Design a protein around this nucleic acid. Structure first.
Ligand SMILES: [Mg+2]
Length: 476
RNA sequence: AUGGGCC
RNA sequence: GGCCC
């Protein structure tokens, strides 16, 4: 978005930290072009003359303003997508109880009991367990008073800027392109879950191309479902965004919230209001307070869902701005936040859509290599989604999610102290789809030091997971 | 080190 | 706890 004000205050919010990711035995074997993101300004790995603080907020370039006619078009697209979504999900969207918002429901998992509480709780000590009883599903006086202000629509907050401690390609580590997490206050998260929690639960349960959302999916199982769907289409596109989250303009955000979360769809009047508080935000980074207009914070409840919904409306908006007679059945798509797979039997010109996405402030580029524009004829076996390719298994005849071996090497090369064993088992479930030979090669540095699951055991587990009859058919 | 998923 | 977004 657009940075409107940068104020220096006395209170310093500690963010820097040291990386908790330590190199494993695999690091010296694979030597990946990957490493922990730069968390300190004095990190020796950083390029000369790179100020980490400036690069972080460089994503905030502008808040794109839309014309009345483009806003009118966007409203129509939001309402059209909002028609499809609530037709599939239903309109049972009344507030969740406090208990349900904390403990979760069918389709919505519970709030994490010991994550960051946000501001101003971080400046007072106080963890999440002191403010909220997670076992009993009850809130203390501090949150109670905050919830009363949100009901009154008088609630004010600040986002706490956190540096994301993660493995990144070495090019981005050296460029100081450390990702950030905007940690919202725990009460804001709770109330959002109250306002839109059942909707979110319904979204998760009904994931698929019909609603254009993969949020809630299990790639082990659903790659067959998504794979067979997109294989039916003549053209498949792999579309990359540049800073998707930060580039959501105030106009697009406000209109989407207005059209999707209407009281006539069963929502409480405050559902629209609580989401609109995400448009103009105050961010706290050390001694600096930065006011931003536009863009989506990442620590919000249902940030993935909001981004997914916007992604759906963006594609409809861009296509209607270029072509005539474009409807929801003109194409098909699945998204997860900024990640997107689009397909159509019509020879759509995504290169011509570039300016139309720009009117929203979004920059689309081909993922199909960083090549000379968008091309036609590509299939689902050519694309990546959720860092996974669509490969066929020749033992079952099903699509399986295959990650790049270079990426799996990177994941196995770094781990938090004392978590290596459980990480290996977790990564084994990802690595099984690379085939027996590659699975063997990936875990070979760990042999004799940790338990590695046999390829066979994870394969048979997966066969049953994707299709229970297929596992039984091998016994018939 | 986080929202939201999934093991 | 890990992974993806
Ligand atoms: Mg992509």
């Amino acid at each position: 978005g657009l940075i409107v004000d940068t104020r220096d205050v006395e209170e310093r919010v500690h963010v820097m930290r040291k990386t908790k990711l330590a190199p494993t035995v695999a690091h010296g074997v694979f030597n990946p072009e990957f490493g922990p993101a730069a968390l300190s300004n004095k990190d020796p790995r950083l390029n000369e003359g790179v100020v980490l603080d400036e690069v972080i907020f460089s994503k905030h370039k502008s808040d794109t303003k839309m014309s009345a006619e483009d806003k009118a078009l966007f409203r129509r697209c939001a309402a059209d997508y909002a028609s499809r979504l609530h037709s599939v999900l239903g309109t049972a969207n009344a507030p969740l109880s406090i208990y349900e918002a904390i403990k979760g429901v069918d389709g919505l998992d519970a709030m994490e009991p010991d994550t960051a509480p946000g501001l101003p709780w971080a400046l007072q000590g106080k963890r999440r367990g002191a403010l909220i009883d997670f076992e009993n599903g009850t809130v203390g006086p501090e949150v109670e008073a905050a919830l009363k202000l949100m009901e009154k629509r008088e609630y004010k907050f600040a986002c706490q800027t956190f540096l994301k401690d993660e493995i990144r390609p070495m090019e981005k580590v050296r460029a100081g392109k450390t990702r950030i997490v905007d940690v919202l206050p725990v009460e804001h998260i709770l109330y959002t879950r109250m306002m839109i929690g059942r909707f979110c639960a319904q979204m998760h349960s009904n994931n698929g191309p019909q609603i254009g959302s993969a949020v809630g999916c299990n790639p082990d199982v659903d790659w067959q479902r998504f794979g067979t769907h997109f294989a039916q289409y003549r053209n498949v596109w792999d579309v990359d965004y540049s800073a998707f989250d930060a580039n959501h303009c105030s106009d697009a955000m406000n209109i989407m919230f207005e059209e999707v979360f209407r009281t006539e769809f069963g929502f409480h009047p405050n559902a629209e209001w609580i989401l609109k508080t995400l448009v103009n935000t105050e961010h706290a980074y050390e001694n600096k307070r930065i006011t931003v207009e536009g863009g989506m914070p990442s620590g919000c409840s249902a940030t993935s869902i909001i981004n997914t919904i916007l992604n759906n409306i963006y594609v409809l908006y861009a296509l209607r701005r270029h072509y005539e007679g474009v409807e929801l059945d003109t194409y098909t798509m699945i998204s997860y936040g900024d990640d997107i797979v689009v397909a159509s039997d019509y020879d759509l010109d995504f290169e011509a859509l570039k300016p139309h996405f720009k009117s929203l402030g979004q920059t689309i580029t081909p993922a199909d290599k960083s090549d000379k524009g968008f091309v036609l004829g590509h299939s689902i076996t050519d694309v990546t989604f959720l860092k996974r390719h669509f490969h066929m298994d020749y033992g079952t005849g099903f699509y399986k999610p295959v990650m790049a071996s270079k990426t799996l090497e990177a994941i196995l090369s770094f781990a938090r102290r004392g978590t290596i064993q459980e990480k290996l088992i977790s990564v084994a479930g990802l690595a099984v789809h690379s085939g027996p030979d590659e699975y063997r090669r990936l875990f070979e540095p760990f042999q004799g030091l940790f338990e590695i699951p046999s390829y066979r055991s994870l394969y048979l587990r997966w066969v049953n997971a994707v299709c229970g009859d297929a596992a039984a058919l091998e016994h018939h």
